[PDB]
Design a protein around this ligand. Structure first.
Ligand SMILES: CCCCCCCC/C=C\CCCCCCCC(=O)O[C@@H](COC(=O)CCCCCCCCCCCCCCCCC)COP(=O)(O)OCCN
Ligand SMILES: CCCCCCCCCCCCO[C@@H]1O[C@H](CO)[C@@H](O[C@H]2O[C@H](CO)[C@@H](O)[C@H](O)[C@H]2O)[C@H](O)[C@H]1O
Length: 732
């Protein structure tokens, strides 16, 4: 199968370069417009009750646009807000930007619009010392994405009022700053990561052309991957986070895939094979290894589709499209480029000891295999102790804390929450709905409200139980159906969300009406629950599919079960350190972030990426161990030769993916630091502790058992065209 494709990619080398590059280049220009068709929601279980409570509530009471923008206005020269001359100056500036942007702004609302008023909440829009006052600027739009795109049209002119002294906070100033970290992370990779991976590529090949090919394949991969997702956006929504994942993960392992193809090609050239025979032996070995490695990551990402979070679904599609296009380009464009170029892939040089490290790998493995229990036992018990911090796992939602504490937009929100306490609330909603269609009586409301007061832990700023669980305000865009009435109240502690939500759902609603418990604490706790309910079924599918794929890439049954254990150990040890640094705070003062509960759908993603990544690096290693073993060599020889003919490649393939990960660990977005650190930690763990010690030690204990497989299972692999674990007699 790969032997057949090895020679066909040489006979049609000119057209597979022309056609496949054209598709990858066509998707690039078609993918430039991808940033204009992305959404920000998908963190909640869309088929849950808290979401239903939000759909019903917005349909009846209307969407709330009061929290879109809150602008803190401060008069210069210590003037008080009662300065009539200053009020006239800023109101005209506000009336001016609304006049110029009627299509983006509904209007502005606040104490300035009525300085002499008797409304308490409007009079609370000013501080007791008359030095600050805030306004609400509701924005136009039918969904949260159109609203945010309207705030970004007016923010510069809005920021210029009051001599520039205006603090913008609320839902949209933060969302602009959160989604803006994406571009900050891309530009940081284009000026700091892609130059670093250029000098890493040159120190493995010594010539510019051999080093430039994996980068070209990686560029063609993301170019064609951004085009695939732009086509996906024509049918279903896609999230903003799916663009960095293509750069953070797809661009990294695509260069890794293109690395084993070019290295194996130069290896066959030095052995004395001609250009056609070389590209066929790489496809039978590295090309086969890369295809298996790509399908494994796919098998690591599809179980996330069991999870109902659309944020996850959009990301799996980006991982699938990036790793598969990478493998396809590796055995098409790259394999044919090596066929056209040939040994003048080593021609140019930098002007335009490789055998001594390969011996150091042999010496280290012989030390490991000589006293293996002295290496396996201390390593695996240390990794188990690194899983202990995972017991302190807490889960939360998005807030202004996802930015560094020195972020101006975050500070403007925190300044609002201390000058004007009471306006910012996260209430749990009791959405009452009658199936009669008849109005809900005032007694039905006071009855459901009386049951909500039997549940402690709810906010009471007035110090009166009669003022608790008020009705939600009715905006002028909602159909005031008296069949549906909702009452809401916030919590004294967010940590009581899961507890108090269950206490509200346990209340017996009035005879005819049915109650839906919603609010952002309910939305968060329902996405948490949906992940950890299908997390075991996800892990079951994740493990059995990756294991059988390695049984085909290799020829053994115990080797895939070994790697699964070494991948589970690397997983738990990596997530325990992350819980130790992003939840408990160890490393927050240096990396500039605040420890806080994690986004629950993000632990599902980090499980998928780390697993498929650690398995891929096991496939890169053992593929040469089995290939040497298939030549009749002993187990200790197959091990040594395995981790010596690839000990430099796997080392180099890890630094590249670590550099691009090291560029996202500086992201102002904290959950990107969590993801990029997870790749950085697991990469170092796999490429050093696992590869150099735990793999040779455990395989030495097993001996010839390492390669064993039942016979009725080896012929199946053989039957499919996947039994090319060993090469043919060739003369060169
Ligand atoms: C009128 C009917 C009221 C409805 C019930 C009250 C609801 C909450 C009202 C209190 C205001 C604060 C609500 C924050 C809740 C939104 C959380 C959320 O969506 O969740 C958001 C993130 O939440 C936040 O970032 C909170 C930031 C600040 C929120 C509050 C601002 C305070 C301003 C208060 C001014 C109001 C006073 C004006 C009255 C004067 C007349 C995530 O989402 P997503 O999945 O898409 O992507 C993630 C991208 N954000
Ligand atoms: C390959 C890996 C396979 C791993 C298999 C994992 C199986 C499932 C693990 C436990 C499942 C239960 O999931 C449980 O959800 C509740 C929801 O409150 C979490 O509760 C935790 O988070 C929520 C939200 O902050 C709150 O309860 C509180 O922060 C904390 O107690 C528990 O921490 C978690 O244990």
């Amino acid at each position: 199968m790969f032997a057949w494709w090895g020679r066909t990619v040489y006979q049609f080398r000119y057209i597979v370069i022309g056609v496949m590059v054209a598709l990858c280049l066509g998707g690039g220009v078609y993918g430039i417009s991808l940033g204009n068709h992305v959404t920000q929601s998908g963190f909640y279980d869309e088929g849950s009750q808290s979401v239903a409570a939000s759909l019903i509530g917005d349909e009846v009471y209307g969407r709330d646009r009061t929290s879109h923008v809150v602008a803190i206005l401060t008069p210069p020269d210590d003037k008080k807000v009662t300065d009539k001359a200053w009020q006239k100056k800023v109101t005209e500036e506000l009336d001016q930007v609304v006049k110029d942007h009627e299509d983006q702004i509904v209007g502005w609302v606040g104490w300035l619009k009525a300085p002499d008023t008797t409304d308490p909440t409007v009079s609370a829009m000013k501080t007791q010392d008359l030095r600050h006052t805030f306004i609400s600027i509701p924005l136009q739009g039918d969904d949260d994405d159109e609203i945010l795109k309207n705030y970004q049209v007016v923010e510069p002119e809005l920021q210029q009022v009051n001599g520039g002294d205006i603090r913008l906070a609320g839902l949209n100033p933060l969302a602009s700053e959160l989604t803006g970290t994406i571009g900050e992370d891309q530009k940081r990779a284009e000026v700091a990561a892609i130059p670093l991976v250029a000098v890493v590529l040159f120190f493995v090949f010594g010539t510019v052309i051999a080093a430039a090919l994996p980068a070209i394949i990686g560029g063609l991969a993301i170019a064609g991957a951004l085009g695939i997702m732009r086509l996906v956006a024509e049918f279903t929504p896609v999230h903003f986070f799916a663009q960095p994942v293509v750069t953070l993960i797809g661009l990294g392992i695509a260069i890794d895939y293109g690395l084993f193809i070019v290295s194996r090609f130069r290896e066959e050239i030095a052995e004395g094979y001609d250009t056609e025979a070389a590209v066929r032996r790489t496809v039978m070995t590295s090309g086969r290894t890369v295809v298996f490695s790509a399908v494994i990551i796919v098998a690591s990402s599809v179980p996330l589709l069991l999870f109902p979070q659309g944020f996850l679904k959009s990301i799996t599609y980006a991982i699938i499209a990036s790793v598969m296009l990478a493998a396809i380009l590796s055995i098409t464009v790259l394999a044919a480029a090596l066929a056209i170029l040939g040994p003048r892939v080593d021609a140019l040089g930098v002007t335009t000891r490789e055998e001594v490290e390969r011996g150091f790998w042999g010496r280290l493995v012989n030390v490991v295999m000589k006293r293996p229990i002295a290496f396996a036992a201390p390593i695996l018990v240390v990794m188990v102790l690194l899983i202990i911090p995972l017991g302190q796992l807490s889960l939360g939602g998005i807030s202004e804390k996802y930015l560094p504490p020195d972020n101006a937009v975050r500070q403007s929100q925190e300044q609002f929450d201390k000058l004007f306490p009471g306006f910012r609330t996260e209430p749990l909603t009791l959405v009452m709905k009658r199936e009669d269609g008849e109005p809900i009586t005032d007694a039905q409301i006071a009855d459901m409200r009386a049951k909500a007061l039997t549940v402690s832990g709810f906010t009471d700023p007035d110090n009166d139980p009669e003022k608790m669980w008020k009705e939600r305000p009715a905006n002028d865009s909602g159909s005031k159906d008296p069949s549906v009435r909702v009452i809401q109240n916030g919590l004294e502690n967010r940590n009581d969300a899961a507890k108090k939500i269950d206490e509200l759902r346990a209340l017996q609603p009035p005879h005819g009406i049915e109650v839906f418990v919603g609010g952002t604490p309910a939305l968060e706790q329902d996405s948490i629950h949906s992940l950890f309910d299908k997390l075991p079924l996800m892990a079951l599918i994740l493990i059995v599919t990756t294991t059988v794929l390695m049984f085909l890439a290799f020829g053994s049954v115990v080797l895939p079960i070994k790697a699964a254990l070494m991948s589970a150990l690397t997983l738990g040890s990596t997530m325990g350190i992350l819980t130790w640094m992003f939840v408990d705070g160890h490393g927050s003062g240096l990396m500039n972030y605040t420890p806080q509960p994690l986004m629950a759908p993000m632990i599902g993603l980090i499980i998928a990426v780390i697993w498929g990544l650690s398995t891929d690096y096991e496939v890169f290693l053992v593929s040469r161990m089995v290939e040497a073993r298939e030549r009749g060599m002993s187990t200790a020889e197959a091990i040594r030769i395995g981790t010596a003919t690839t000990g430099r490649l796997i080392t180099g393939a890890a630094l590249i993916l670590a550099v691009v990960a090291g560029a996202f660990v500086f992201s102002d977005l904290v959950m990107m630091k969590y993801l990029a650190f997870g790749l950085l930690i697991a990469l170092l763990l796999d490429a050093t502790i696992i590869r150099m010690f735990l793999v040779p030690a455990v395989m030495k204990l097993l001996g010839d058992d390492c390669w064993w497989a039942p016979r009725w299972m080896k012929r199946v692999q053989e039957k499919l065209g996947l039994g090319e674990t060993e090469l043919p007699d060739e003369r060169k």
